Amino acid sequence: AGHGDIFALPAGEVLGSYGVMNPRPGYWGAGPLCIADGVEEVRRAVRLQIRRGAKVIKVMASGGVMSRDNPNFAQFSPEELKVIVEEAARQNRIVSAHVHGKAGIMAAIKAGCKSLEHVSYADEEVWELMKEKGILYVATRSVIE
Amino acid sequence: DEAKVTIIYAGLLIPGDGEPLRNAALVISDKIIAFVGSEADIPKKYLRSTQSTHRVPVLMPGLWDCHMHFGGDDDYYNDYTSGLATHPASSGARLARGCWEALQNGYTSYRDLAGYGCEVAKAINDGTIVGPNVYSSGAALSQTAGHGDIFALPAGEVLGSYGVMNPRPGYWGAGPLCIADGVEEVRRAVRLQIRRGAKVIKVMASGGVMSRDNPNFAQFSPEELKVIVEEAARQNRIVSAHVHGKAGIMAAIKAGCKSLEHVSYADEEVWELMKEKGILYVATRSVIEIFLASNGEGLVKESWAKLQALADSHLKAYQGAIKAGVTIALGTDTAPGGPTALELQFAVERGGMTPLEAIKAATANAPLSVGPQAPLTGQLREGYEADVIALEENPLEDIKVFQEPKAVTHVWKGGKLFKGPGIGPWGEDARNPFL
Amino acid sequence: EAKVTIIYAGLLIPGDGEPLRNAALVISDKIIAFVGSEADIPKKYLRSTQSTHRVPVLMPGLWDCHMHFGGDDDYYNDYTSGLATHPASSGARLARGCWEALQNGYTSYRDLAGYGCEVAKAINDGTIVGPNVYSSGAALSQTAGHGDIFALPAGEVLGSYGVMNPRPGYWGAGPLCIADGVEEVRRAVRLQIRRGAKVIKVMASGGVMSRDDNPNFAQFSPEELKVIVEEAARQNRIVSAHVHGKAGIMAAIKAGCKSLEHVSYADEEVWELMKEKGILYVATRSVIEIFLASNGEGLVKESWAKLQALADSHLKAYQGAIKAGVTIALGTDTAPGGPTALELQFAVERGGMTPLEAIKAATANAPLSVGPQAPLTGQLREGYEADVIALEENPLEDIKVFQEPKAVTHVWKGGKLFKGPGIGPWGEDARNPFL
Amino acid sequence: EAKVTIIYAGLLIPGDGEPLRNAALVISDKIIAFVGSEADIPKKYLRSTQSTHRVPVLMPGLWDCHMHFGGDDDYYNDYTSGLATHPASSGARLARGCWEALQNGYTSYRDLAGYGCEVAKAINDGTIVGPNVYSSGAALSQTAGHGDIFALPAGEVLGSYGVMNPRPGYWGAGPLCIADGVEEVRRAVRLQIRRGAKVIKVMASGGVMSRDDNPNFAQFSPEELKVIVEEAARQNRIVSAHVHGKAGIMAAIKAGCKSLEHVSYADEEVWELMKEKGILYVATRSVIEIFLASNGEGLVKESWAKLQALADSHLKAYQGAIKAGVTIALGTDTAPGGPTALELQFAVERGGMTPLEAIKAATANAPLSVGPQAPLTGQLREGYEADVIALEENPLEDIKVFQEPKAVTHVWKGGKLFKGPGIGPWGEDARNPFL
């Protein structure tokens, strides 16, 4: 049910294709999207991208005004984000977080993400944190335009 | 094109929370209520701009039932097996009749706590059918061997259908029930309901006297309940917990649930906690009353003693909560179109509410049952949503008035007339959506 | 005590045969007890009748022999919506449609792909109202056939709709069934019957879906079609074949199909075979007319030349069949509540039927579309089923009269009034089924 | 307004027939409007033409009738790379290859195993450029057949490429399809058609892969081959059979295959049958020549004696077929962009064709390799498709001229210039399709 999910399809088709359970023939673990719920699953989720030669890890950490969906709501738990960062860090990758609302922004920061996309509700507080922590700001303004 | 303005003059206007007005008027502008006050005080701009006026004896908010189940089961299986065996197309057809019927009784909002509310609301919102505002849980979450489980079927069939492992074709993750065990699974369990558009999350947090089963025993671990609350909270939902025994009640509270159903063993301590924490109490007395009316035909002696003991507790709990001034809303655990109005009767005649408090429980308080997902509604006030009904008779003099749908003469939902003089079955300006 | 109703008609169109003037029809319970002149009504019925009516025009309830009970979300334009739309949503929407159908005087639908079986359960238990629904269950298609969803990958489609790999999730109960080989095709027919299918529908040719799609190519092997017919035959169903090109037509015939849809490349040889073998011809002209009215907005040059060539051929086929006196019924390939009446217009204005023959195609002939599953119906005759409608205006003078539902004033299905003066939305003596 | 181009040619090689000197060809839009002497050009074209060209040599676009669209990672030497290489990698690599193909004057490829169907989508939508691709989809092989990957265990291979057990992961859409039994083999052909396959390819014999492998042994039963042909035939495809030994050859013929690859043990009897039945002979000599050039580096004594014995037999077969006047086309079993031109050299220097007959095999005859899926093409004639190339040098004097792509100066596919003076890498009027 996150920003990467394909809401128009039923849930079984999507997790069948892109979940980190149920290994099978058909280039399992090697698509545009990976859906993982819970600390256990998110470890295999990062590990599967590294397996392909990923040089960065990308999380959806907020909603994205896809339906009448809320960009203000955070996505993934802090517990999952922390683990995702740590997994990437162990292989010398960073994590880049899709964030709009301040709650998602703050959680991605707190977790250890070093790059943020859109960052649409960034304010004074976010700017100072990003400078203090050396976190890249990638506005992606073309999408809004 | 200008705003669509409607003036409704009322002999008696029951706002929902607060003293009723005599010789009052309410103005609707488009979807919201633009003015409430005396007939004398209507602003002149609305007298100028109005396209339609009405005069009725009694005006009040659209009613809520805060505990419905959108199941539409075939009649065949008497237990929960029907939920699994009934094809959802059948369920959906039947639920369409029920939501129509709900609207005709002045029920403009339902909180579905287990079933297809999400899926059926799509056909309400796109205009294909008509119905109340539906705030749905999607599936009720239950542990294995919990109150949601179908004990009569073997475990593999049930978790195959309703578990959060083993994704597959067949509308996986989209049934009346979701079974999840452990912190990991319960995260996907909440997430799957949100995926469907759930506007509340419902947990089974105690047993429910289904077998010679214990309502005193809690269900789910505290660890799971905490996580379930947090998951809902992150998407700005609240969690509503089915609870009977005090252990389950206390655990649901501790976890962060903001709504409790039945609450049968609630005592002094529970009442104070619910007030302190702003937790809605939904007694669902109609369910108890059903099996009191059966009177123990074909039940063993001590299993009937057990139901009465629970019923008596449930009664004291509700009475004490009302007297203690716990915040209360009404629900019945029925199918759409069912006898939701009965709960007003029981609120008065069992609970001991005044008819006015009973109405408050079914209107002004009821949106609390979805927390932050509630619009400003359930009250006749400026700025609130135009969910308004009119009655022929004064329900403060006889609360049973609500049980004759002929007595609800006009129904507005979101400023639109769905029932009223010269208004068709599918509401005003209804067009066949298949042409 | 039999429930007797007398209907006096200025004009009585029986369905097959010369219309009567100054006529009457008697209903006794569910069957038609008498048809003849007002003068000749038997006196026993004048004595026993509890209600009488007087109307300008009376005729049989109308049939559409080619409907699809899909109720899809609007989101996906193609067949993906059939898979992605949750069936609870579909069922809700189909309830509106069946209501709407009945209001237009359509008392029978033959669903050739979808949830007719599942929705008819809610009609028959009285929860909603609608036409008599004879459903195929899923349309049978080969892999890469006209029923397949080419835009999705193959695994997703056969996972959802194949006859292998049984699993939780209403397996074997969707709008589509894909089966390859004699073995699989036995289970394919059997699974529809399991749902209560009253006809079996095959895709036996391509259907100009893409540019690499060819309506001239047959689908399924003769070996599979033969077995499909035999399986249906054993349960006293017939098979209805979607066919365009002559190769597919000839194969469906050879196999034993007794109903053909579209039949776009039917020529002399096909017409004679259909008459010789008693095979119903359902043109489904409305489908061609839809993409003629688009006129090639955003289509490549030669792909529009291809549709017109098919459309032209489909026209000549239909015209030739009518002239050759092939037995014909009407269908539209629409959702319930859709514009079924249009097909009468096209039967006259394209096909070249007389308005009277057009009515025959939508009434007396239409039960042939389900073979031995048909009761004696579609005609105003003694002993036939009381599916009867009344109109304000004479449709023999303007066949487009059927396209104003206000013009159908009374609808009886099985002797029960579902529309008529002072009669509610859910029919006479309707009760809320959830109380 | 038609887009008209005049090409003056010192030498025009039409494909089937005597070459013209001092000739011209007119293109109108996508088809060839005129072929004849420069003197005889119709005046209307001299008036209407927007561009003219003058070149030494003009002929049809070349065909390779035996390509494999694999795009494998280099890592695995055997067939394992087909399974292990991610198809996104394969597709990228195949884009270079199709570009490179077009630059050498190859305007049509018949892919007999791989992703031709999937890559042609990006050619046809204009994202990349390439030849007309007629693809088999996956090659069909029995378990333990020439398509099987013996080095992996059986479960992994049938999990990936079998026609049972549909699942997420682009099921049914790989370079290989394994099917055993009549039932499975229906779905096998159907799955390729689903992808847009324009020919069906079977493995009908062994292929000296190992020492326990025998090219003399047939593969698939006659029962399976018959059904495979019939399935293809119903969609207007033909089947092309990989065959070495006479038993496999005879079975493929008997079944109804209309194209044979390698045909290494073809003798008098086979030649006559192929002529009698109109069966294309594609020798694929380049494959034999590769392992002749290795010369038995790290091969056992008798396993090198086995390859030479096959190579010799393959040679006599091809030579005899040419002399017997069997209809022949050319293919190489290479990746797109590979050394397709080599096969012309071998047709002359091994087969003993004249350079003119060699060109006929790569042009006028080559569309026979897809039977009814062929447009009128491979020839410079009025009404045929404008797939035209120009060379700097006369290939009738040196057939190796084709192996320098600098020597192909102009390439037209469907009347559109993809290579020529002042013309960019992606062809004329190319736009970045992502803006």
Note the resolution in Å, 1 decimal.
Answer: 2.5
H-helix or E-strand containing C161? helix C154-161
Q: CA B182, CA D308: separation in Å to the nearest integer?
A: 66
CA-wise closest residue to C272 among C255, C249, C288: C249
Q: CA C341, CA C339: separation in Å to the nearest integer?
A: 6
C48 and C89 housed in the same domain: no
Neighbouring subunits of A (3+ Cβ pairs under 8 A): B, C, D
CB B170 within 8 A of CB B112: no
Tell the burial category of C10 from Cβ atoms under 10 Å away from its Cβ (0-12, 13-18, 19+).
middle
Residue-number span of the structural domain to which D373 is assigned:
62-379
CATH of the domain at D338: 3.20.20.140
B81 and B56 housed in the same domain: no
- Give A 51-90 residues with CB within 8 A of chain B: 70, 73-75, 77
D357 and D417 housed in the same domain: no
**Structure solved using which method?**
X-ray
What phi, psi does C27 have (nearest 5°)? Answer: -100, 130
Terminal Cα-to-Cα distance of chain C (whole angstroms): 28
Domain end position, chosen among C348, C379, C410: C379
Contacts across the B-C interface (CB distance below 8 Å): 161
Q: CA B422, CA B427: separation in Å to the nearest integer?
A: 10
Which amino acid is located at C265 in the chain?
Y
Decide: helix, strand or coil at residue B68. Answer: strand
CA distance A9 to chain C (A): 5
CA distance A14 to chain D (A): 9
A-chain residues near C75 (CB < 8 A)? 8
CA distance A87 to chain C (A): 32
Gyration radius from chain B CA atoms: 22
D-chain residues near C151 (CB < 8 A)? none
Beta bridge partners of C57: C11, C391
- DSSP string across D228-257: HHHHHHHTT--EEEEE-SHHHHHHHHHHT-
Residue B19 per-residue DSSP state: P
D290 and D314 housed in the same domain: yes
What phi, psi does D399 have (nearest 5°)? Answer: -65, -20
Domain end position, chosen among C379, C398, C421: C379
C94 and C209 housed in the same domain: yes
CB C33 within 8 A of CB C45: yes
C285 and C413 housed in the same domain: no
Residue among D198, D333, D413, D419 flagged as catalytic: D333
User: How, if at all, do strands D20-28 and B140-142 pair?
Assistant: unpaired
H-helix or E-strand containing C412? strand C408-413
- Give B 174-193 residues with CB within 8 A of chain C: 174
Residue C198, marked binder? no
Q: Tokens in use for D1?
A: 């307004």
A10 to B173: CB separation less than 8 angstroms, yes or no: yes
What phi, psi does C340 have (nearest 5°)? Answer: -65, -35
B329 and B184 housed in the same domain: yes
Domain end position, chosen among B363, B379, B395: B379
B184 and B69 housed in the same domain: yes
CA distances from B120 to A9, B124, B334, C229 (A): 17, 7, 16, 37
C-chain residues near B90 (CB < 8 A)? 91, 118-119, 121-122
CB D60 within 8 A of CB D103: no
Tell the burial category of A51 from Cβ atoms under 10 Å away from its Cβ (0-12, 13-18, 19+).
exposed
Q: CA C97, CA C99: separation in Å to the nearest integer?
A: 5
Decide: helix, strand or coil at residue B243. Answer: strand
Peptide-bond breaks in chain A following residues (C–N over 2.5 A): 68
The region that residue C337 occupies, defined by phi over 0 for left and psi between -120 and 50 for alpha, beta otherwise, is: left
D55 and D180 housed in the same domain: no
Which amino acid is located at C82 in the chain?
G
Tell me the CB-side half-sphere exposure of residue B61, using CA atoms within 13 A.
30
CB D168 within 8 A of CB A13: yes
CA-wise closest residue to C285 among C362, C178, C232: C362
Residue C218 per-residue DSSP state: B
Decide: helix, strand or coil at residue B58. Answer: strand
Q: Any idea which residue has 């932050």 for tokens?
A: B372
- DSSP string across D359-372: HHHHTTTGGGGGGG
CA-wise closest residue to C139 among C68, C238, C208: C68
C-chain residues near B97 (CB < 8 A)? 95, 122, 127-128, 426, 433-434
Of A8, A12, A26, the CB nearest to C76: A8
Q: CA B161, CA B155: separation in Å to the nearest integer?
A: 10
Residue C435 per-residue DSSP state: -
B103 and B219 housed in the same domain: yes
Domain tally, chain D:
2
D113 and D238 housed in the same domain: yes
Residue among B199, B202, B360, B419 flagged as catalytic: B202
Q: CA C239, CA B230: separation in Å to the nearest integer?
A: 55
Q: CA C307, CA C295: separation in Å to the nearest integer?
A: 10
CB B68 within 8 A of CB B336: yes
Q: Any idea which residue has 């003694």 for tokens?
A: C382
Of A15, A21, A74, the CB nearest to B234: A74
Q: Tokens in use for D340?
A: 């397709």
Residue B106 per-residue DSSP state: T
CB D138 within 8 A of CB D111: no
D-chain residues near C148 (CB < 8 A)? 194
H-helix or E-strand containing D273? helix D268-277
Within 10 A of C321 (CB to CB), how many other CB atoms are there?
23
Strand intervals (E) in chain A: 57-60, 95-99, 115-118, 136-138
Q: Tokens in use for D363?
A: 């042009």
Residue C242, marked binder? yes
A21 to B165: CB separation less than 8 angstroms, yes or no: yes
Residue D242, marked binder? yes
Residue among B73, B112, B149, B333 flagged as catalytic: B333
What phi, psi does C182 have (nearest 5°)? Answer: -55, -45
Q: CA C138, CA C145: separation in Å to the nearest integer?
A: 14
CA distances from D317 to D83, D167, D214, D241 (A): 33, 44, 18, 16
Length of chain B in residues, anyone? 435
Q: What is the 3-state secondary structure (H, E, C) of C79-113?
A: CHHHHHCCHHHHHHHHHHHHHHHHHCCEEEEEECC
Q: Any idea which residue has 């026979």 for tokens?
A: D368
D-chain residues near A17 (CB < 8 A)? 168-169
CATH of the domain at D9: 2.30.40.10
A14 → chain D, closest CA residue: D168
D172 → chain A, closest CA residue: A26
B179 and B242 housed in the same domain: yes
A10 to B187: CB separation less than 8 angstroms, yes or no: no
User: How, if at all, do strands D20-28 and D31-37 pair?
Assistant: antiparallel
Residue among A55, A58, A131, A133 flagged as catalytic: A58
CA-wise closest residue to C128 among B86, B127, B74, B96: B96
Gyration radius from chain C CA atoms: 22
**To probe the interface with A, which of B183, B227, B235 has the most A CB atoms within 10 Å?**
B235
A6 → chain C, closest CA residue: C84
Q: Which residues of B are annotated as a binding site?
A: 67, 69, 202, 242, 262
